[PDB]
Amino acid sequence: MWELTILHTNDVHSRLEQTSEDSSKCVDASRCMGGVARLFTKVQQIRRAEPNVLLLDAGDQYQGTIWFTVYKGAEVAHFMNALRYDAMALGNHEFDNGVEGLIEPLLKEAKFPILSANIKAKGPLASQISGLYLPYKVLPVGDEVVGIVGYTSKETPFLSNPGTNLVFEDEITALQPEVDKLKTLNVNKIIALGHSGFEMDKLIAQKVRGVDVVVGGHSNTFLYTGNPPSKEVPAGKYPFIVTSDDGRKVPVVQAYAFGKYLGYLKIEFDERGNVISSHGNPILLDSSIPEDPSIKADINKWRIKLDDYSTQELGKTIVYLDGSSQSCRFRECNMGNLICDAMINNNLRHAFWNHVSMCILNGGGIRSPIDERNDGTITWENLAAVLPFGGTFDLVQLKGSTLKKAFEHSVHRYGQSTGEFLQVGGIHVVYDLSRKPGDRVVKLDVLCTKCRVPSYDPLKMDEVYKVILPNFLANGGDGFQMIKDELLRHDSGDQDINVVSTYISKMKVIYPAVEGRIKFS
Amino acid sequence: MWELTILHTNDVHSRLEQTSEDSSKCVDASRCMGGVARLFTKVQQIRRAEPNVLLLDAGDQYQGTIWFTVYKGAEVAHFMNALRYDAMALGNHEFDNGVEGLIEPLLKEAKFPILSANIKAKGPLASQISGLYLPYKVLPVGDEVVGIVGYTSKETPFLSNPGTNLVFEDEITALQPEVDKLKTLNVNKIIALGHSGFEMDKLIAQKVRGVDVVVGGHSNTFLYTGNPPSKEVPAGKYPFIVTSDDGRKVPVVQAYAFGKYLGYLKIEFDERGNVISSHGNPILLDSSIPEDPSIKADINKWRIKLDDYSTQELGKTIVYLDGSSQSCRFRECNMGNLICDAMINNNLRHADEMFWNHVSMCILNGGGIRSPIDERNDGTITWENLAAVLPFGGTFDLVQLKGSTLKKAFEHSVHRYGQSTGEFLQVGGIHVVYDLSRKPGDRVVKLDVLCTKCRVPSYDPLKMDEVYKVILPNFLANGGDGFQMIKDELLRHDSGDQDINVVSTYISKMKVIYPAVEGRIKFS
Ligand SMILES: O=P(O)(O)COC[C@H]1O[C@@H](n2cnc3c(NC4CCCC4)nc(Cl)nc32)[C@H](O)[C@@H]1O
Ligand SMILES: O=P(O)(O)COC[C@H]1O[C@@H](n2cnc3c(NC4CCCC4)nc(Cl)nc32)[C@H](O)[C@@H]1O
């Protein structure tokens, strides 16, 4: 009846300090959630009360706040070491700053194993990266041993910068042999830890034989059994039980994201290394759990470098700038409208032809909301959380067919928190999700340029339009292969942050609204 | 067979200089229309060729451009005298600057009769206005005599400032006694000249017995027989023939407005003073009719005072700011949106406490939008450009309204739709849907309003029992344009800032503007 307590975080996304419950900057400290210093308290309490504890991360500690912008990963390595994480699987964002941006800050500093069984190194890189990351690590858990096989999304080269010499294999194909190797080493307790999303995690559990528990992330999935503690509605019960093809019940877990919740799963194992019981729930990390003084004091030492960013206010918002994934990836969100307006305003300030009236933007690219409760105030730090990436707002030229195609893509796999869903500037779209995928756009009206008075006219499949979009999309990011393939021109614009930072500095006081640009039938 | 040539203008609205064909400021002089110096050339050219000519004005020479803002009527009196107008009926706008603003500049200075048979002076006013205007004037036309009875819109006190000591009678009731009086003076040739609109003009012709011809204005009606010379689509043939209740065919005329066209109607009269033939058409004052050098030279003398306004640029528009009556009074117009956005932006720049002190709604009578702005001159926008759009001198006032009062105003907005009636509201942060098939007062099928009592503003269906904070012009607040329910059922009214200054500072802020027709107002 050997009991294992699995504690896990996924998609912390540079959320080192305690946050608001929407995961934005903390204002009212007493009503603030998350943090690393608050995580350390709960982890330590659990480690006291429980004999066999593992602390894991399913990737995406990289990218999100001014913490990563400045420390570029050093903060992940330093604080994950203080919290004494047992393992961490590689996420797509760990490659955002290139392989040198992963090797030097994280791989070379992390005093704990970093894992991925489907990333295959090629060329001279292989002998450089030797043992910096591993397909698995066999860990001593008291008087027993626990093997943990890692995995990273096949999609990392289309979401990040992992370079031309890392091969991203299919997870199931790359996992099953490593599991069988651990099996022939008599490792009876196998955990799959990785960054591919809940739907992938469900199949890893179903297909990869020998896996006792699947720990995941990427899809920012919140799972809960009972009455949730906050605003997150669960996708399913915690853990999610997958009846695998070999006849076992495989528990699948995820801890939402941004370090708001600490995943907690108690596992009963037999002498043979099989699951008998699998129960728990994610602990909401809040005010009712103090921040450890030593970690908090240390967090404050690292905050001196970051202080010289929030210094200047670029404007004030009288409304809540909803940049949440739960809004921006399912329907029209005021942060989308605000950004898309700033892009058009950027272009039309210095401009029938050369005039731009259209803007598209993948909702997943909107990485944080902004609270209006702090005197309306907006700083660089506030924006750096919304737009962390470092892209540009590029000018493209598209056929009515290519624009139709992208909008049909926008809602092809709708209701999955998929970031392909587009927020729009100077476009009026109407979707009918009852209809089969690819014929879900029932109306699409676009603002005209070849007109003295701009009005919305039905989109013409044979006309040519001049859209402002992020470079990520211009480059066929988010599956928009048709943009990169069928574009008739592409001129590269200005830095995403600077574009929106110019506009807020201009408007002085902003108030974007949900006015019906995107609609549903 | 005694022939009369009637030449007429109506609703010139301070358009002294030549204009663009949308009646906005002239840029490319060679492709510019109208003005007083072009008018003088064609008038003089007709007076030579024709023996019995009359030049008339059916009111509204007052209000419109920087000309009236500065000269306050003196420019009307000076230039109408130079053009040697035979008569002029009183329009509603002649009262915009009060009765002292009519007596001192126009009535005393005008070397020609000014008329209105339904305005009745009373008390201390009566005395200070004796013979300054008259119900009619009998005019010698060659070897014959022509009587002209004037008339002014019953709703001048709800459209202008004529004061409390002037009584606006029902036109037909006040007109007949004068026509029947003139008849007993053996005045066989009677013209009705007034400012009440085409639909009133049609009834004056129908009901007022003895009227031979009705000359009008107010409704900026363009009438034409054949292929029009410009962008104005005609309401009907010129002249419009009204088969009167006494058995006669009464020609009804109107010359559009802003001095763009000169009305021209040739009339054949018998020994008895009746119409036999009534034919003509409005002459478009275009590039092809030269400006008279003496009038143009004199116009230039008066332009020195006006020059120190257009001096500073307040911003640039990349789009055509359509402030036309043909757009702003029938459907959503980008000038309405621009203004309504500037009003909300004015308030919300100095606001926020919680869900109160906030405003997300704006209503604005389309008739209050008095001019468009052309983007063709380097995008550029001056004070003079704005002064034409917003000439009145009102303010953008803050009101508090029930869902029912707001519903009522929106049902009013389209009660008599398709008449170029200015009551039709342009909106800021409101999404309205009309179905004109439905009987009047139940034509609003959808009305969604932007919320304040929400952290994220979204459009929610209007609630008949909730209370909303709208920014609207003072004219509308004080229940102008028939919006009696606003004045009567308002739950609070705090007065804002000067209409021009509100929109100027927003243009000075935005630097480069581009308003659009984005579906705030819709139709089913
Ligand atoms: O935390 P995740 O694993 O990302 C979960 O969210 C998935 C969505 O995120 C969106 N997304 C992800 N990465 C990007 C990126 N990155 C580029 C800049 C730095 C590297 C490449 N640039 C942009 Cl505009 N968007 C990115 C994309 O819309 C995905 O659907
Ligand atoms: O203008 P006319 O040729 O006479 C015929 O058109 C009638 C429409 O015009 C609009 N309208 C007329 N007067 C006003 C005014 N005046 C106030 C300021 C000066 C005195 C009262 N203030 C305002 Cl916002 N609007 C005015 C109004 O929308 C009428 O329905």
Ligand SMILES: [Zn+2]
């Ligand atoms: Zn993530």
Ligand SMILES: [Zn+2]
């Ligand atoms: Zn991820």
Ligand SMILES: [Zn+2]
């Ligand atoms: Zn007029």
Ligand SMILES: [Zn+2]
């Ligand atoms: Zn009038």
